[PDB]
Amino acid sequence: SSERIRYAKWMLEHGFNIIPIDPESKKPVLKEWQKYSHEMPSDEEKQRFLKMIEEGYNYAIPGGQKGMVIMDFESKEKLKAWIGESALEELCRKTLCTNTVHGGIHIYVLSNDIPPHKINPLFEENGKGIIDLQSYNSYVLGLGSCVNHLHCTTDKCPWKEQNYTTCYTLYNELKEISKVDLKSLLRFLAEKGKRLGITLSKTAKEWLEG
Ligand SMILES: [Zn+2]
Numbered sequence: 001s002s003e004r005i006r007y008a009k010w011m012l013e014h015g016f017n018i019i020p021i022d023p024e025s026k027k028p029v030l031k032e033w034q035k036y037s038h039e040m041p042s043d044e045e046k047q048r049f050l051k052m053i054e055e056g057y058n059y060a061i062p063g064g065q066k067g068m069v070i071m072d073f074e075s076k077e078k079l080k081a082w083i084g085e086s087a088l089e090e091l092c093r094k095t096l097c098t099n100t101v102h103g104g105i106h107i108y109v110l111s112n113d114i115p116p117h118k119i120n121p122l123f124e125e126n127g128k129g130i131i132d133l134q135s136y137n138s139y140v141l142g143l144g145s146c147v148n149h150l151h152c153t154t155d156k157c158p159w160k161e162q163n164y165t166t167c168y169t170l171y172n173e174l175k176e177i178s179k180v181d182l183k184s185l186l187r188f189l190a191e192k193g194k195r196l197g198i199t200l201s202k203t204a205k206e207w208l209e210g
């Protein structure tokens with residue numbers, strides 16, 4: 001059927017919980033969705049969730065689950081200039097990467113050492129955050145979810161008030177979320193970005209240096 005339901009089922013198939021997003025509130029259908037970073041909803045809730053998604057609801061994937069976190073970059077073209085085409089392609093060759101509805105890129109990874117607390121933004125350029133690590137108490141919309149930008153009136157949306165719809169799509173091809181050495185990755189990004197005005201945030205460098 002739809003890509004939205006296919007990918008939602010694919011995440012569940014791999015042991016990751018998902019939660020429907022209410023069409024109106026644009027927030028998870030359950031207020032206490034954070035519990036899904038540590039336990040499953042059970043057969044009942046699951047079927048109910050899948051029905052909402054099949055009927056058209058978008059869905060989200062809570063971070064932190066089984067050591068899975070999502071590096072949420074605001075701009076894909078910026079990352080390409082940042083680490084280079086070769087580095088980006090290799091990274092997305094080894095793990096799942098997706099295009100966001102605003103031109104960003106989500107890189108899903110598994111890590112044995114997840115920050116015990118929020119250290120966002122990870123990096124900044126010209127005094128502003130350009131990437132956030134989505135871990136516990138956060139989520140990202142999943143593949144197939146679509147957003148109509150007509151109601152977006154902030155400068156965070158490039159498509160401000162446009163009668164235009166975009167969706168979360170695969171960067172290249174569907175691939176398993178694989179393990180990465182998070183701290184080693186961040187050091188690579190730090191080294192590559194210094195010559196482009198991209199630097200780690202105070203809290204990020206803190207954790208990175210222990
Ligand atoms: Zn928007």
Ligand SMILES: [Zn+2]
Nearest residue numbers: 014175176177
């Ligand atoms: Zn698999």
